[PDB]
Amino acid sequence: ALPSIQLPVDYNNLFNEITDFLVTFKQDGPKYMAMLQKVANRELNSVIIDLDDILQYQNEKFLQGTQADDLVSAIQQNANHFTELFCRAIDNNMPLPTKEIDYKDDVLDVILNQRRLRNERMLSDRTNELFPPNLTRRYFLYFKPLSQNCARRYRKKAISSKPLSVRQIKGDFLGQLITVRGIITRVSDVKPAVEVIAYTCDQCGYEVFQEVNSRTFTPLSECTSEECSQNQTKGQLFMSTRASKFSAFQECKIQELSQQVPVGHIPRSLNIHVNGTLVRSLSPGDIVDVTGIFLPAPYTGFKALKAGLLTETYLEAQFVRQHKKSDVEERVMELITSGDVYNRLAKSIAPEIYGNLDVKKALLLLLVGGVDKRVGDGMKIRGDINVCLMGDPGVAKSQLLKAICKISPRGVYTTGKGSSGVGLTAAVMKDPVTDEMILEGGALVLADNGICCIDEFDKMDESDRTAIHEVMEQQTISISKAGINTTLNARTSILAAANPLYGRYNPRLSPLDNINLPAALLSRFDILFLMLDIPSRDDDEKLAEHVTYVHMHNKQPDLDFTPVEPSKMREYIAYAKTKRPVMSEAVNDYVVQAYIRLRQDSKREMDSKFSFGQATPRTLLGIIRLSQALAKLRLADMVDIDDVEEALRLVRVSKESLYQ
């Protein structure tokens, strides 16, 4: 009956080694003596116990004798018991007072204080087997990995260490603390779980503590307390939810890197649990070096169904290392003194793509946008720059957007399918797995007061079309679907790459012929740049040399420009939206006059032909908002006459490209 066999592994002395491991050390007073206090001092919760110092401490325990039994390898070979033992002794040497505990102050702090004071005092009357040590903690324990440059002491092989793929993950890895890397997916929302969980009793009281072991347990009532028990007949008892403790729990799957995988073989995502202070550490779609204890959790069931028992297991979180996490106006002040903020930063836009700085020129207006205005009633006048692209097929205009949202504040990079109607209109898309019927607005909701970036904009169908057809009135998205009648803010900025119908726009053809969009939707944008690709035996040379500059090199540009990086740039771009220019009346009247002949030449050209007229109000609205945009590029707030005129250059330049 249960054969039993000796093994070199013994917990007995290792416990002692743990006592000498903590509070006695130097190289990092020591870290284990007063930080432990700072936990007991209640300024910190997570106890970070590094495998690093387990190694360096064995440098103190070997080299530097007397020799000691294995640790980090014994750790990562078992991984679970070392939080039930290495941590259990922590109760012994923990500082008493500690400093300034108060009582309430903190809720339930007085509960447990008076728990054990009423416990000892009700135990004092009986004396005139104790609340388990895991009950009073208020500190989690997190092991962290050793990569390591000092793992090169060396123990060599024993280091994992490596962030192996789940394909690399194996059945002998059960009960082994390891590193794994991969993308976050579906990341279940944080929920409380449970820990002991004291249920009160009805007649003479007392209490009992049901340990929280596994994923589920049997609840119990009866009466345990000897006094309520047997007299009479049995003391009833219920759960006290304020006598309960809950460890933090958020479980999240992490998918494979997909280049870790053999060529066939669909990605295999693995199950992970989060416990403790490391809750909220992980968010959807995030690559990280994640280390943790990997244990089987059968079953519930089913049961006799499985067989063999076929564990199905899971991972628990231990450590998180995440790849890729005024004096700032001074960081801006080489650019402020640089001069040529508008043309230079216009060159700085998408430095990868060659040519058409005239396009980037307006993209510049977009990144800052602004300033809006509020009419005092009020109804917002955008304030938001909706500018569109055109021309085809590739142009890598997608790159313009691709970098823009990557850099421009609160960006959304989208396409026709792409962000759907329900990818743009908040509905009730049933939530997969964890339930139920949650609401996620995509696109126009997701990043608001920021740019939406579209391609395949004609393939958005009508699902997006009528809603965005509203979003040019901006400042809303209405939803009557299901039981929810709200109109939620889409404050989103709009931009699209317009890909004309197959296979390219035809120069003889009248404008809007290439475009498959509604006629009512293109007066809704302010301005648009059509991108024609016309063979020139000159520019296609430098182009093909630009295409052959790959793969020869990595860095494309030279002779000469120095790219302007997003951080420092974004801070001026966010420095500008605060400026809020106010038009002088001189420039205002000038915005009227040339706009009259603008309201004449698009009209006196009559029949559509070139078109479109009329230079509608929205182009004046725009021209004004564009000088409101252009001024912050100057700072000012005084809105120069040429500060208007610079938008005036872009006005016709947008159109009239329809000729070539």
Partner: protein, 326 residues
């Protein structure tokens, strides 16, 4: 045990032959001819196929998206072009991948979300056609007859070169990188030759961009040719291929050519020459079609087994695109 079957085992004495032949400078054409024992000529198409059989290397950017190196082509022409049967040669020597007649779907290589579970309460995906075809040859009978709805993920198959799955479900984006060749018949009758390529496409539009080559093959009659057409067809019913697979496989992993500027000093002149000329004849022209000059040259670069790209390889490319559009 579970042994796979049909990699391969080259010893020494064999690869010594591989290289002994590799020294010879007409071998490209040679390898091309042996591909179709029955089939007449179409050697330019043959070459194109081998060019797809290498994979044309790859280059992955650092901290950015990859530049696809594998080759995607399509056949078009009147019935009895041997297009389907030609695909069936790419069925065996090619070391995978799997071929399909039109339909096709659901989403082809899309898993289509095995549901529910199977088993023990775990919703599962399973290898789709295109997925199973990762780093292999997808072939299509009647790519013109596939649904317009499939085509969506097909775009996703070629440029994006991956598989996006939202369905139930698991959001994994898994590598779809694949060599893909298909055949389409003239939309309407024998007018493939008479009609413009526009309306002759049968599958617009971005579908056309991703294609490295569109091959129009005429059923047109030459009685002079028809005699030839007959005799070899009759002696049908009445330079070695297996070794060709043993060679191609070796040319994949050893070695990748990288590049030399010599091809570059020419194919550029060639591309602009296309844009200033090929628009006085037909369409289309894009940067992408030039990126194929890279891939094409690189393919023949693996054919020479040269440690590096060389100018004459580019001359092989300049060869192939002419006949591509004329």
């Amino acid at each position: 045990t579970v042994y796979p079957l049909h990699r391969q085992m080259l010893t020494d004495f064999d690869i010594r032959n591989i290289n002994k032949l590799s020294k010879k400078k007409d071998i490209f054409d040679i390898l091309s001819q042996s591909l179709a024992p029955s089939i007449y000529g179409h050697d330019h198409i043959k070459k194109a196929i081998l060019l797809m059989l290498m994979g044309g290397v790859e280059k992955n950017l650092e901290n950015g998206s990859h530049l696809r190196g594998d080759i995607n082509i399509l056949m078009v022409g009147d019935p009895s072009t041997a297009k389907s049967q030609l695909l069936r040669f790419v069925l065996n020597t090619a070391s995978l991948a799997i071929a399909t007649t039109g339909r096709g779907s659901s989403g082809v290589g899309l898993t289509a979300a095995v549901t529910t579970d199977r088993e023990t309460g775990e919703r599962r995906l399973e290898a789709g056609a295109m997925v199973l075809a990762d780093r292999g040859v997808v072939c299509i009978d009647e790519f013109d007859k596939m649904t317009d709805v499939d085509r969506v993920a097909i775009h996703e198959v070629m440029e994006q070169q991956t598989v996006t799955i939202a369905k139930a479900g698991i959001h994994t984006t898994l590598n779809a990188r694949c060599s893909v060749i298909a055949a389409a018949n003239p939309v309407f009758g024998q007018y493939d030759v008479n009609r413009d390529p526009h309306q002759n496409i049968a599958l617009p539009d971005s579908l056309l961009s991703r294609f490295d080559l569109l091959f129009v093959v005429t059923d047109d009659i030459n009685e002079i040719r028809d005699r030839s057409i007959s005799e070899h067809v009759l002696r049908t019913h009445r330079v070695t291929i297996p070794f060709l697979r043993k060679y191609v496989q070796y040319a994949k992993e050893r070695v990748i050519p990288q590049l030399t500027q010599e091809a570059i000093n020419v194919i550029v002149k060639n591309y602009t020459d296309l844009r200033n000329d090929d628009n006085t004849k037909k369409s289309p022209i894009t940067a992408r079609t030039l990126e194929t000059l890279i891939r094409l040259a690189t393919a023949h670069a693996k054919v020479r087994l040269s440690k590096t790209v060389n100018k004459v390889d580019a001359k092989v490319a300049a060869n192939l695109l002419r006949f591509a559009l004329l």
